[PDB]
Amino acid sequence: KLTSWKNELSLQALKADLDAAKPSHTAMMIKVK
Amino acid sequence: QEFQISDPMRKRVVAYEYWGFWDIEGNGVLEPIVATWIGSTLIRLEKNPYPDGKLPFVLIPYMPVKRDMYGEPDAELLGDNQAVLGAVMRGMIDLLGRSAN
Amino acid sequence: VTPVTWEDVQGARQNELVLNYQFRTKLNRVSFIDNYVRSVVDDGTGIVRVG
Amino acid sequence: ATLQNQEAESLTGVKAFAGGVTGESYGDVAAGIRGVLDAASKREMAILRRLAKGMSEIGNKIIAMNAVFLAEHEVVRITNEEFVTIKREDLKGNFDLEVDIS
Amino acid sequence: EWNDLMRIEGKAKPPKVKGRSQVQPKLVRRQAEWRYSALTEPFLGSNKLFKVTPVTWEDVQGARQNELVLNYQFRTKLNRVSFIDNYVRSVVDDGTGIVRVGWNREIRKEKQEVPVFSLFPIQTQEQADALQQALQLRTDNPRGYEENVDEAIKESVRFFDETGQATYAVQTGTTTTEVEVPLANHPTVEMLNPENIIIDPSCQGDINKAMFAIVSFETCKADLLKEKDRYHNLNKIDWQSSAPVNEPDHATTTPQEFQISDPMRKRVVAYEYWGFWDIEGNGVLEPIVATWIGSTLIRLEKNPYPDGKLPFVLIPYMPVKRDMYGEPDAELLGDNQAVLGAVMRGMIDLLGRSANGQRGMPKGMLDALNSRRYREGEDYEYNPTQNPAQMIIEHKFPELPQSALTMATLQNQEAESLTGVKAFAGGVTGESYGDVAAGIRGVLDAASKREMAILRRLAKGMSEIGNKIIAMNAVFLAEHEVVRITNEEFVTIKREDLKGNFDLEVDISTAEVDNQKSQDLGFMLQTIGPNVDQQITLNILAEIADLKRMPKLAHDLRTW
Amino acid sequence: GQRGMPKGMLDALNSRRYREGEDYEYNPTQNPAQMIIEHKFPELPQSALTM
Amino acid sequence: GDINKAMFAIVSFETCKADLLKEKDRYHNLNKIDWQSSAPVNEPDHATTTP
Amino acid sequence: TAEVDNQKSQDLGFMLQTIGPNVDQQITLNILAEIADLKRMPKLAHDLRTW
C-alpha cells in the first residue's frame, strides 16, 4: 500500500513490538523515577 | 496539560517513530527501515536515509552495569546514607526547637 | 579531526571546520553540554538523538 | 552525621571542595609531582572517557550526514578552499578520519 | 555467592526486624569500586589500543600494516570503551573473565551493469606514457589510483599484470553482471556470562589442554541465514520451542515474557561445541565445531580459524594454584563485611529507639495555672521544694560507646591489609607500565606492586585476543580491503606460518611507553653521527613523526 | 537498644505517653535522667587491643 | 638434600589414549590396557583437580 | 630485568665515549648495533651491522 515492498509492514505489527517491549521498559523507569 | 494553541497549523501532536530492521523483501535479509504513525494512522514508511545504516541513537552510561544496556547513578549507593543523615539532623532541631528558651 | 593515513590530511582539515561551524552557529553548544552531562549523572544513562 | 558523610565520600569518590582538576590532563602524559592524577582523579577520568566516546560517536554520525546532505558550494563557502569528496560506498567505513574532542 | 556480597541480595542481607535498622555498609562494593578505574585507565588513555612490533629486521613492514588494521577494527567496528568496562568489571566481580572471539561476515549478491572493452596492442607513444602514469600512481598512491583513474586505463593495467603487454582499451559497450557486495566482514569479541560456558573439568587448570568447551547463546533465524550454506537442516526447527523460558539453564538479561511475534526475528537459544574429536577414527584428534538447536544438529565442520584451538580466553583475578578459575577479593572480605554491618546497625538501633525531644516534668512543681504558663512560653513561678534546673528532663540521644567506633575501624583496617586497596589511594600505577623505575616520587610502592600484578594478567589477555584476530585478518580479509585501510603496499603471510607467530609481538600501547620510545630514537639520533648516512637519519626521523601522530610528515621523510 | 524503666515512676497513662513519643509527668521520687536504662555496647578492654 | 644425587624419581600424571598415540612407536604393549581401570578413582594416591 | 638492560646500555655508551670514535669504524658500529638491540629497534641494528 504505502510502499512497493512485497513484505510491507502493517501498523498493528509495528505496535505489536511496542507492546512487547513495554513491560521491560516500565520496570526500568521505576528505578529511574 | 491545559496548553493548546487554537491555530490548527501550529497545533502540537504526539508522533511515534520506529527505527529497526525488517525483512522488507520477505526473503530472509534484514534492512534498516523507519516508520512514523500518529493516532493509529501510518504517515511515513521508508528505508533508513542516513548513510550509517543504523539507529540514530547514542547511549552513554554513568556507571556501567556488566553486560547490560542501562547505567547506574551514584544516587543508588547513597539512598540509606541520606535517610540516616536526615534523621540525625532533624533530631538536633527537635531538641532545640521544642525546648524552653 | 585527525587523518589516519598521509593522504587523509586534506579531508580531515575540511571536515574539522565544517563540523565545528555547525556546532558554533546551528546549535547552542553550552546549553547542549549542560543538558548532556546532567542527564547522564542524574538518570544514570543518557540517550541522544541525531537527525 | 560524620560517618554518613565519610561513608558517602568513600563510595562515590566525590569530596566537597576537592577534585575538578582532571580536565587539564585529558590525553596528556603524566605531569610532574604536583600535576599527576591521584586515586580520586582516576575514578573521575573514567567517567570522562564514556562521555568523550559519546561525542566521538555523535561526530562520526554527523560527518557521514555532511557527505550526502551538503552540496559542493555549501562546503566551499564554509571552508574557503578546494572541495574534497568521499565515495558513497566508503561512508559505512570510517577509513580516513578520527574524531575526538579538542 | 560472591556476587551476593558485592550487591547485598543473598545471605549477606540482614534479616527484617520491625523496630530495628536494616542498613548494611557495602564494604566489598567499596573495595571493588576503587579497583575498576585503576585498571581500566591504562587501556583507554590513548587513541591507539594495540602496539605491534617486529621480531626480526625483515618483519618491520608487516608489523606496521597489522598495527593499523587491528587498531582500525577496534576504533570503528567495536565500542572500545564499553568493551573494556565490561572486560575489567567481569574479572574483578566474578573472579575470572571469559571472552569469546569470532568473525562476522555478511556477503550478499548484487546485479549491476559493467562496461566491456577490446584490447589493441598497437598504440602511439602517448599511450605508453599514459599507461606508465597509472602504474606509477598505483604504487605511489593506491587510493589516488582507485579514485581518479579512468576505467579503460585500469583494464589495460590489469591486463598488464597478468600478461606483461601494453594494449589499448576501447569502450565497446556495456553489459550486466552479478557480483557479491561485501558487508560486515569484521571480527567480534564479547564477554561471556560464566554460567553460559562449560569447559572440560580435566583441563588441569590450562585452557589449551581442555578437550572441549560448550557455549550457550541467543540467536535469530535472520542471523543464521547470513551464512546461507554454513547451516544445514534449518527447516526442522519449529521456531516456537527452545525459547529462553524453555531453556532454564541459559542465564540471560532478556525478559522472560518478551517474545517478538515476527518469526524471522524470533530469539532462540543455540549451543556450540568446540573441541577435539577423532573424525577419521584412526587415533588423531582434530579441532571441530558443532551447533545444535532443540535436539537438532544444524552445523558440524572443522575449526575454521587458523589458530586451530578454542576461541575462548580466560583471565584470572587472583590465580589459584594449578586451577582454571580465579578468586575475587570478595572471598576474603565475607566475614569483615558482616561484622561491620552488625556494628553499624547497633549504633542506629541505639539512637533511633531512644527518646528525643520529649519533655518530662515532676508532678507537684507547677500548679494548675503556672504549668499552663510554662507550656505556653511565658514566665512562671514554681514550688521551691523542687528545682526546675535539674528536675525537668530534656531527653536526647545517648552517647555512643567508644568500642563501637573501635570495632568498626578494625574491620576496615583488616580488609585493607588483605586486599591491598585503600580509599583515596593508589590508581597511579597505569603511568609506569613497561617503564623503568622513575625518581623518588615516581617509583612504585608495595601497594602498586600488587596492583601491577593484576594488570599483567589483564594485559596478557588482550595480547592473546590481538594474536587471535591477527590470524583471522590473514585469511578473512582480501587484498583490496587491507590496502584501503593502510594506503600502502600489501604484505602477505604464508598460510602454513599462521600457527606460529614468528614475526609479530602484540602488546597494549600506553602513552608513556610511546613517549619513552620516542626519547630512545632521539638518544640514538644524537649518539649516531648524523652524517654517517642520510637513510638512517631519515628512517629514525620518520619513526618519531609516527609516534607524535603526524602521518603526513612521516611520509615526506620516508620518500625525501 | 533495650530500654529499662523502674516500676512505679510513671502511672498507667503517663507510661503510655512516654512510649508514644509525647510529653509526660513522673513521680518525683525517681529521677528519669538516671533511672531509665539505655543499654549499649560494653567498652573493650585495652588488653584485648594490646595482645 | 641434593637432587642431582638422587638415584630415582617417580611422577604420577593423567594421560589419554590419543596422547599416547602421538608417539606411535615410542609406546609398546598398548593394547593390553582395558581403558576402564586405573581411573583417578581407582588410583586414590594421585591428587588431581579432576572431579 | 628492564634495569639490568638499561644498565647494560649505559655501559656501551660509556665505552663508546671512552674509546676514540676514529680508532676503528667496525668497533664503533658493533657497539652502536648492540645498543639498538637493547632499545628494541631490530631494523636499525641490521643497518649498522651491514653498513
Please spell the DSSP secondary structure of chain G, one letter per residue. Answer: --GGG-S---------HHHHTTSTTT--SGGG--SSSS-TTT-TTS--S--
Please classify residue H1 by burial: count the beta carbons closer than 10 Å to its beta carbon, then call 0-12 exposed, 13-18 middle and 19+ buried.
exposed
Residues 6+ apart with CB under 8 A from E417: none
For CA atoms E90, E92, E95, E99, give the dihedral sign. positive
Q: Show which residues on chain D lie within 8 Å of chain C, measured between beta carbons.
A: 51, 54, 58-59, 61-63, 65-66, 70, 75, 78-79, 81, 83-84, 86, 95-100
Q: Which residues in chain E touch residue B23, judged by CB atoms under 8 angstroms apart? A: 222, 262, 264-265
**DSSP line for D31-55:** --TTTS--HHHHHHHHHHHHHHHHH
Nearest Cα neighbor of E101 from E117, E87, E118 is E87
Work out the minimum CA distance from C49 to partner chain B, whole angstroms: 5
Determine contact, residues E47/E16, Cβ cutoff 8 Å.
no
Determine contact, residues D100/E82, Cβ cutoff 8 Å.
no
Q: Can you tell me the distance from the alpha carbon of E146 to that of E481, in angstroms, rounded to the nearest whole number?
A: 13
For CA atoms B32, B38, B39, B40, give the dihedral sign. negative
Distances (CA, A) of E512 to D29, E435, E509, E522: 6, 8, 9, 15
Q: Can you tell me the distance from the alpha carbon of B62 to that of B57, in angstroms, rounded to the nearest whole number?
A: 17
Determine contact, residues E458/E88, Cβ cutoff 8 Å.
yes
- In 10 A of CB D59, how many CB atoms? 22
Determine contact, residues D52/D101, Cβ cutoff 8 Å.
yes
Half-sphere exposure of B39 (CA within 13 A, CB side): 3
**Number of inter-chain CB pairs under 8 A, C vs E:** 22
- In 10 A of CB G27, how many CB atoms? 10
The DSSP output letter for E496 is: G
G23 DSSP β-pair partners: none
The DSSP output letter for E68 is: H
β-pairing verdict for E267-277 and E212-220: antiparallel
- In 10 A of CB E59, how many CB atoms? 19
Q: Can you tell me the distance from the alpha carbon of E425 to that of E110, in angstroms, rounded to the nearest whole number?
A: 59
Joined together, the cell numbers standing for residue D60 give 562520526
B20 DSSP β-pair partners: B33
Q: Do chains D and B touch (3 or more CB pairs under 8 A)?
A: yes
Length of chain B: 101
For CA atoms C1, C3, C8, C10, give the dihedral sign. positive
The DSSP output letter for D30 is: -
Q: What are chain C's partners, defined as 3 or more CB pairs within 8 angstroms?
A: B, D, E
Q: Can you tell me the distance from the alpha carbon of D30 to that of E428, in angstroms, rounded to the nearest whole number?
A: 10
Work out the minimum CA distance from A23 to partner chain B, whole angstroms: 16
Angle between helix axes D2-12 and E27-44 (nearest 10 degrees) is 30
B59 DSSP β-pair partners: C47
Estimate to the nearest angstrom the gap between the alpha carbon of E140 and the chain centroid.
Answer: 37
Testing the interface with E: which of H41, H46, H50, H51 to mutate, by most E Cβ within 10 A? H41
Question: Residue B44 in 3-state DSSP?
Answer: strand
E136 DSSP β-pair partners: none
Nearest Cα neighbor of E176 from E219, E113, E254, E257 is E113
What is the radius of gyration, based on Cα positions, of chain G?
15
Q: Can you tell me the distance from the alpha carbon of E320 to that of H38, in angstroms, rounded to the nearest whole number?
A: 35
Q: Can you tell me the distance from the alpha carbon of C28 to that of E69, in angstroms, rounded to the nearest whole number?
A: 37
E258 to A13: CB separation less than 8 angstroms, yes or no: no
C47 to B56: CB separation less than 8 angstroms, yes or no: no
Among the partner-chain residues C2, C6, C8, the one whose CB lies closest to the CB of E549 is C2
Burial E389-405, CB ≥16 within 10 A → b, else e: eebbbebbbbeebebbe
Q: Which residues in chain D touch residue E112, judged by CB atoms under 8 angstroms apart? A: none
Q: Can you tell me the distance from the alpha carbon of D39 to that of E37, in angstroms, rounded to the nearest whole number?
A: 9
Q: Show which residues on chain B lie within 8 Å of chain C, measured between beta carbons.
A: 56-63, 69-76
β-pairing verdict for E286-292 and E267-277: antiparallel
Determine contact, residues C1/D99, Cβ cutoff 8 Å.
yes
Q: Which residues in chain E touch residue H44, judged by CB atoms under 8 angstroms apart? A: 524, 536, 539-540
Residues 6+ apart with CB under 8 A from E460: E315
E527 to H36: CB separation less than 8 angstroms, yes or no: no
Length of chain G: 51
Q: Can you tell me the distance from the alpha carbon of E380 to that of E375, in angstroms, rounded to the nearest whole number?
A: 10
E114 DSSP β-pair partners: E175
Q: Can you tell me the distance from the alpha carbon of E314 to that of E321, in angstroms, rounded to the nearest whole number?
A: 15
Task: Please give the angle made by the CA atoms of E91, D14 and A30, to the nearest 5 degrees.
Answer: 70
Helices vs strands, H then E, count in chain D? 3, 1
Work out the minimum CA distance from B5 to partner chain D, whole angstroms: 33
Q: What are chain D's partners, defined as 3 or more CB pairs within 8 angstroms?
A: B, C, E
- φ/ψ (deg, to 5) at E302: -70, 165
Q: Which residue has the cell 599416547?
A: G20
- From G22, which residue of chain E is nearest by alpha-carbon distance? E284
Distances (CA, A) of E458 to B21, C50, D30, E99, E314: 36, 36, 22, 12, 10
Determine contact, residues H32/H16, Cβ cutoff 8 Å.
yes
Q: Can you tell me the distance from the alpha carbon of H27 to that of H21, in angstroms, rounded to the nearest whole number?
A: 8
Q: Show which residues on chain E lie within 8 Å of chain D, measured between beta carbons.
A: 25-26, 29-30, 33-34, 36-38, 40-41, 44-47, 72, 75-76, 79-82, 85, 147, 423-428, 430-431, 441, 484-485, 511-512, 515
E104 DSSP β-pair partners: E186
Resolution attained, angstroms: 2.9
Q: Amino acid identity, residue E197?
A: I
Q: Amino acid identity, residue B28?
A: G
Distances (CA, A) of H20 to E275, E337, E523, E524, H15: 63, 68, 19, 18, 9
Among the partner-chain residues B68, B84, B91, the one whose CB lies closest to the CB of E253 is B68
Among the partner-chain residues A13, A16, A24, the one whose CB lies closest to the CB of E258 is A24
Determine contact, residues E411/E336, Cβ cutoff 8 Å.
yes
Estimate to the nearest angstrom the gap between the alpha carbon of E57 and the chain centroid.
Answer: 32
β-pairing verdict for F24-26 and E359-362: parallel
Q: Can you tell me the distance from the alpha carbon of E202 to that of E210, in angstroms, rounded to the nearest whole number?
A: 7
- φ/ψ (deg, to 5) at E366: -110, 135
